[PDB]
Amino acid sequence: QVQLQESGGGLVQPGGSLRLSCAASGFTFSNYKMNWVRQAPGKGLEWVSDISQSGASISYTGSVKGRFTISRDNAKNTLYLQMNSLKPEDTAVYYCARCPAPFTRDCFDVTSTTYAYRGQGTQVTVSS
Amino acid sequence: NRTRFPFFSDVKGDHRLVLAAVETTVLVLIFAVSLLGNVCALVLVARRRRRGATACLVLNLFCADLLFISAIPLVLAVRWTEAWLLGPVACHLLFYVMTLSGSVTILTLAAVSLERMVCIVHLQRGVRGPGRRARAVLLALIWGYSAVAALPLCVFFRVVPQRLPGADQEISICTLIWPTIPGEISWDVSFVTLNFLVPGLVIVISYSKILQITKASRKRLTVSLAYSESHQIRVSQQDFRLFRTLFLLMVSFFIMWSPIIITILLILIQNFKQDLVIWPSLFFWVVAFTFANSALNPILYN
Amino acid sequence: SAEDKAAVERSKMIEKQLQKDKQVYRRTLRLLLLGADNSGKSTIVKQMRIYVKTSGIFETKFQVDKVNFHMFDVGAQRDERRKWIQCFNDVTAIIFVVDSSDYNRLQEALNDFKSIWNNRWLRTISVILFLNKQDLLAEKVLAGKSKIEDYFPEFARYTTPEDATPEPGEDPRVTRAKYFIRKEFVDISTASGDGRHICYPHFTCSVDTENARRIFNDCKDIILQMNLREYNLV
Amino acid sequence: TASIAQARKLVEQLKMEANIDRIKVSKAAADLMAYCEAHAKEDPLLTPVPASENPFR
Amino acid sequence: ELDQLRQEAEQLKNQIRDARKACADATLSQITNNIDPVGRIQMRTRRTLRGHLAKIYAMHWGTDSRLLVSASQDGKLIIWDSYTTNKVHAIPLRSSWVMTCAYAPSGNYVACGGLDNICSIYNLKTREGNVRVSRELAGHTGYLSCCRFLDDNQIVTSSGDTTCALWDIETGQQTTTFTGHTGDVMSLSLAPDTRLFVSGACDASAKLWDVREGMCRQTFTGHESDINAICFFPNGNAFATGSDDATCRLFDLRADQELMTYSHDNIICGITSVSFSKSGRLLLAGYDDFNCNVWDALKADRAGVLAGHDNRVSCLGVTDDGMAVATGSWDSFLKIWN
Ligand SMILES: CC/C=C\C/C=C\C/C=C/C/C=C/C/C=C\C/C=C\CCC(=O)O
């Protein structure tokens, strides 16, 4: 049973900081490439960042570079995101996503049509 | 009355067995490597189920190589004995087989090259390549012309008694006796020109044209598609392997089939003006060198 | 006997017909068209075309200088595309259409291009890239209300190359933006690796006439490279 | 209420699938071994046939 | 409320898990550890069938064990005699993206489908002797993945729109629709008595369906990626699944849980097709590394290899008398092993 459980989230004032974490179960964690996606009020699913099989390659989107950081922990099967200098445009719901097949280097996973290997999400609010 | 040139026939004394051993080692190595390479090449190219015309043209090349390479043991036996004891059947068949195989090899290389260039041109133009009928016609023309123009070397070789310099014993020699000299000169010039120069010219033209097209299509990207300066240096990175191979395939032709041709012309001068001096050892070494094509080709074209 | 010979005769007739159809199959060029909602692949179809509900796929046919092209466009499917794409691994080329004037969905297109370039069953297939709607991009850049470096900060320090060959009379700002946007795709086309397939980028508008000729030339180059790798010259 | 509809459907499906009869693994293993042993000599890929009984050879 | 429903679902899943845990008093491997191995199993090609121009996506044997049907992405469907390698029929299609085949148990009809979302039915025995389209079944909204006849008048289909359907041919409209999956449905298999069937559906789950009344009875999990193939054990009380994570598994319908796993450390590629043997002692699977493996179904050991293809193996089948095995791949050739 492929299960992905997110934790973190909450409300902060602008300029604050947060740490999100995801715990995985039901597969061999170290064989897969991992992603972070998010959805905003009135928007669709957008891609935030991704990390590779071991952590040697990392990638971000143009609007978060210098503020967000991603990391793995393969002994505990956990994925982490550190969020600094939060702006009001970051209020959303965040999901953790897994690639379809192992040992590959392509992805097909922002689909609204109920992608199967994804968690329920967590709420991040940046307002004052 | 002039002494006639002894093809393959020379007499040595004290050092006979050592030179025999060296020549035998060279010829055995040539025979072994040629047989192995050509049989592996036939096994590989026969296996394919999705094929082209080049497949069977290359098959023709390999079969010509194998027919060529089968004349080693007779010449080896003649070199051991120093005397033409094999008989008239050999003295009419050996040189005919050799010349037939050589001419077929050269013409097949030319036809393969022209096919490659024209097929590039037509597959650009959105049509089909060669059909079976034209291919059968081409193979029939190759083997018919080869078997016709190589004719005099079958009925103009004779076994005659000849004088060995420095001895009073006469030995049988397999040699060439022309009925008249002008016909000899005409055949020699024709067979030199229509089996060496025309295929060489065709090969050079074809491979040069392919190089020109490839370079133009490479520059088109950086002129109109407008990549960059540092992007095309990341996409090519391999073009050298092309610009080398074509070049190689158009120079080895002139290094392997040129030394024999020169030899032939010298003989005519010997048969015209006695002032030239040549040796049968030269002839045997030139032939043992031209026997390297049947081991070189299975590598370049595969 | 009296039956087996009839069976042999029937099989011979079938073989005759198959040998007739092989010639037509091996002489036409097949193309796959991909795009998105805001792109204009429909107007590309509607321009080069004249030259059952719940249907899964549409086809169009055209012919340039006596060569025949079949172009396929997917119709009624779902979002997930990782299963029915595998059956397009034998086509001559993939025509990928992008809307170049929106700045908000260019990263999504870049991710699509990355996924198509690096797939296992699509590694030998070349892409022809159409960056559509030039006039909207030129107007938006001349407006001066939306900044590209709100989405791509590297545009802050980019400067147009000293060896470039621009169009006759274009405002340099438009040239700088165009060159940057094309660079974004050719990077993922050179950093990918390998080196067997190639990408051919063009800039096209909403009213144009020359796209069939461009497809013709690019397919010629693809075929020549294939013929250069089929005759063991590499 | 589409999400609530999906949740209600899932809950009803779980309640329906929660009440069935289950036997232990040993019985299933025994049945599999017995079936495989009873038909062992009728398998032409495990006990190849003579050339006179083979139509593809 | 949403939260209460989620909590209740979690509690129900916990109860199901514990109930299944109470039943695992042993394992298949501790019991069958005194059976002699089958030994080395060796096979060779008796026939090679040529004539398709492109990839091959499907095949299916007739019930007499002599004739078979195959489909290619050229746009053709060929019916072969396999004792002599003669061609009996060659039918051209209206759409060339075909992905499935089936052969009626009476011998009178064939069916096909693909990316046009339509299921086409061809009559082979007409008064003139011509094959012409008898029916076109329409109503799905995604490509057709598989289809299997029940009799001359009923058929069952699975599509990439997450449903399955039961069709009545003469009238032309569905009679029952089976819903519950979340992703595409990839493979489909019928029971010997044709009262039940199983489906494997690209979300790492398999389901058991009741044809007449129309509900999902049981749901099986245990894989970690998509499921590509499925079939029934000859007994009728078990089935085998092959995934994209390089593993095959064996499931039982009366214990209601996983029973066996077949994988190896050198194998890191997916599985395309799966089938059983007449007695059920061998399991055959085709891979993306171009060859097939033959496994011992009661001890999980590799006992043979079939290796003659030069591209991805895409289909696999065994006759109803147990004499031959057919394989087809993306290189356009079909081979018959014995
Ligand atoms: C077409 C290429 C030319 C020759 C064939 C190439 C290699 C085969 C060589 C075989 C060895 C002997 C060949 C011919 C033998 C004798 C010819 C020598 C002289 C006759 C002509 C003359 O005396 O002017």
mmCIF file with all atom_site columns, C-alpha atoms in Angstrom, chain A residues 1 111-118, chain C residues 78-80 82, chain D residues 6 10, chain E residues 143 159-164 178-186 199-207 209 216 219 226:
data_model
loop_
_atom_site.group_PDB
_atom_site.id
_atom_site.type_symbol
_atom_site.label_atom_id
_atom_site.label_alt_id
_atom_site.label_comp_id
_atom_site.label_asym_id
_atom_site.label_entity_id
_atom_site.label_seq_id
_atom_site.pdbx_PDB_ins_code
_atom_site.Cartn_x
_atom_site.Cartn_y
_atom_site.Cartn_z
_atom_site.occupancy
_atom_site.B_iso_or_equiv
_atom_site.pdbx_formal_charge
_atom_site.auth_seq_id
_atom_site.auth_comp_id
_atom_site.auth_asym_id
_atom_site.auth_atom_id
_atom_site.pdbx_PDB_model_num
ATOM 1  C CA . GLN A 1 1   ? 0.000   0.000  0.000   1.00 0.00 ? 1   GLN A CA 1
ATOM 2  C CA . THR A 1 111 ? -2.281  15.630 -13.589 1.00 0.00 ? 111 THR A CA 1
ATOM 3  C CA . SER A 1 112 ? -5.588  16.632 -12.051 1.00 0.00 ? 112 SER A CA 1
ATOM 4  C CA . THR A 1 113 ? -6.963  13.227 -13.085 1.00 0.00 ? 113 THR A CA 1
ATOM 5  C CA . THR A 1 114 ? -6.187  11.679 -9.723  1.00 0.00 ? 114 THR A CA 1
ATOM 6  C CA . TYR A 1 115 ? -2.508  10.777 -9.925  1.00 0.00 ? 115 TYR A CA 1
ATOM 7  C CA . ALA A 1 116 ? -2.231  7.646  -7.819  1.00 0.00 ? 116 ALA A CA 1
ATOM 8  C CA . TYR A 1 117 ? 1.057   8.118  -5.930  1.00 0.00 ? 117 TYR A CA 1
ATOM 9  C CA . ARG A 1 118 ? 0.502   11.364 -4.022  1.00 0.00 ? 118 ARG A CA 1
ATOM 10 C CA . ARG C 2 78  ? -7.426  11.747 -20.438 1.00 0.00 ? 78  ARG C CA 1
ATOM 11 C CA . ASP C 2 79  ? -4.571  13.730 -18.898 1.00 0.00 ? 79  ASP C CA 1
ATOM 12 C CA . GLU C 2 80  ? -2.244  10.825 -18.111 1.00 0.00 ? 80  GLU C CA 1
ATOM 13 C CA . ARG C 2 82  ? 2.560   7.621  -20.092 1.00 0.00 ? 82  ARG C CA 1
ATOM 14 C CA . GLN D 3 6   ? -16.601 9.404  -2.996  1.00 0.00 ? 6   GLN D CA 1
ATOM 15 C CA . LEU D 3 10  ? -15.485 4.035  -0.268  1.00 0.00 ? 10  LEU D CA 1
ATOM 16 C CA . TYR E 4 143 ? -8.421  3.623  -25.813 1.00 0.00 ? 143 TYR E CA 1
ATOM 17 C CA . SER E 4 159 ? -10.605 0.735  -21.553 1.00 0.00 ? 159 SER E CA 1
ATOM 18 C CA . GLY E 4 160 ? -8.229  3.439  -20.415 1.00 0.00 ? 160 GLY E CA 1
ATOM 19 C CA . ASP E 4 161 ? -11.068 5.458  -18.897 1.00 0.00 ? 161 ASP E CA 1
ATOM 20 C CA . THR E 4 162 ? -11.093 3.397  -15.615 1.00 0.00 ? 162 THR E CA 1
ATOM 21 C CA . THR E 4 163 ? -14.186 1.269  -16.423 1.00 0.00 ? 163 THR E CA 1
ATOM 22 C CA . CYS E 4 164 ? -15.127 -2.145 -17.778 1.00 0.00 ? 164 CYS E CA 1
ATOM 23 C CA . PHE E 4 178 ? -18.157 -2.013 -13.807 1.00 0.00 ? 178 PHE E CA 1
ATOM 24 C CA . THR E 4 179 ? -16.660 0.990  -11.984 1.00 0.00 ? 179 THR E CA 1
ATOM 25 C CA . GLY E 4 180 ? -14.320 1.438  -9.038  1.00 0.00 ? 180 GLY E CA 1
ATOM 26 C CA . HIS E 4 181 ? -10.782 1.705  -10.382 1.00 0.00 ? 181 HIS E CA 1
ATOM 27 C CA . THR E 4 182 ? -8.905  5.012  -10.273 1.00 0.00 ? 182 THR E CA 1
ATOM 28 C CA . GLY E 4 183 ? -6.380  4.604  -13.104 1.00 0.00 ? 183 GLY E CA 1
ATOM 29 C CA . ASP E 4 184 ? -6.323  3.023  -16.542 1.00 0.00 ? 184 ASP E CA 1
ATOM 30 C CA . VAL E 4 185 ? -7.347  -0.620 -16.744 1.00 0.00 ? 185 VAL E CA 1
ATOM 31 C CA . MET E 4 186 ? -4.537  -2.616 -18.309 1.00 0.00 ? 186 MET E CA 1
ATOM 32 C CA . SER E 4 199 ? -8.950  -6.972 -13.755 1.00 0.00 ? 199 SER E CA 1
ATOM 33 C CA . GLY E 4 200 ? -5.568  -5.318 -13.238 1.00 0.00 ? 200 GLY E CA 1
ATOM 34 C CA . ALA E 4 201 ? -5.624  -1.559 -13.537 1.00 0.00 ? 201 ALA E CA 1
ATOM 35 C CA . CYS E 4 202 ? -2.505  0.590  -13.358 1.00 0.00 ? 202 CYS E CA 1
ATOM 36 C CA . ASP E 4 203 ? -2.913  1.870  -9.806  1.00 0.00 ? 203 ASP E CA 1
ATOM 37 C CA . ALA E 4 204 ? -1.245  -1.117 -8.125  1.00 0.00 ? 204 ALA E CA 1
ATOM 38 C CA . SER E 4 205 ? -4.463  -2.993 -7.360  1.00 0.00 ? 205 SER E CA 1
ATOM 39 C CA . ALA E 4 206 ? -6.466  -5.888 -8.778  1.00 0.00 ? 206 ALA E CA 1
ATOM 40 C CA . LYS E 4 207 ? -10.188 -6.529 -8.489  1.00 0.00 ? 207 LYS E CA 1
ATOM 41 C CA . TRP E 4 209 ? -15.849 -8.836 -10.540 1.00 0.00 ? 209 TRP E CA 1
ATOM 42 C CA . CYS E 4 216 ? -16.647 -5.750 -6.953  1.00 0.00 ? 216 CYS E CA 1
ATOM 43 C CA . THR E 4 219 ? -9.599  -6.027 -3.909  1.00 0.00 ? 219 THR E CA 1
ATOM 44 C CA . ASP E 4 226 ? 1.505   -0.448 -12.439 1.00 0.00 ? 226 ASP E CA 1
#
